[PDB]
Amino acid sequence: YQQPPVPYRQIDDCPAKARPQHIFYRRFLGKDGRRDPKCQWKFAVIFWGNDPYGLKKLSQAFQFGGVKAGPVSCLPHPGPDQSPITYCVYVYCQNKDTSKKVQMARLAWEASHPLAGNLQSSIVKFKKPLPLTQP
């Protein structure tokens, strides 16, 4: 089955290809990327595109205390036929502003590296808290 990406004890645990991306997000998020055990996770941001690789790097690029990305999934076919697959990644955040910043984070990364694909993203709000909290 599908397994979520591993947590990082040290920054060297991050896959080499996504290492420049994980660092940038870190510095950018800063204390916002830190976990705030007050906050319940009702929010996320869904990145989707045609390229599964750039989304894979993004999945392993955001891994933090307050910002966590799920593995690489896909959206079901729009019509009766099989459309070209649109892969998607859910990055779960702790609030409305954090998710906005995670959206800005990837947008900033895309401005730094035009060779990286320019993705699509939408803010997500869950009505119920997701069990991303550590006991």
Add this chain to the structure above:
Amino acid sequence: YQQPPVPYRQIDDCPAKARPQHIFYRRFLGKDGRRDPKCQWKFAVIFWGNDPYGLKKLSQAFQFGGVKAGPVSCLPHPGPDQSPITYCVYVYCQNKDTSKKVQMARLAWEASHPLAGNLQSSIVKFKKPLPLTQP
């Protein structure tokens, strides 16, 4: 990578073990299973549990015009540690009404069948419409 669930042009295509659940939702949702162009898909429902099995059936149980479930995926690890895996499936809908009816469609099945466990669920809202409609 992961693959989106293959659409069904007919009832038989649903996996043998998951057949009764699919037919249940088809009658239960009814007119709500219709595909309405007027409403873009801003909504969804995420079911989650430890059992990847019950999520598989559900993922292939909801496939309709106005109801599309994605592939079986998972939530990120709660802490820096490694935790027992919590799987999840996003059932996408074009409105708050259909999605809220999808949620109780599962509960109606759960109360009917003691074998299928009780899955925690949350209503999902996206601000930007997802590309779930014909080109």
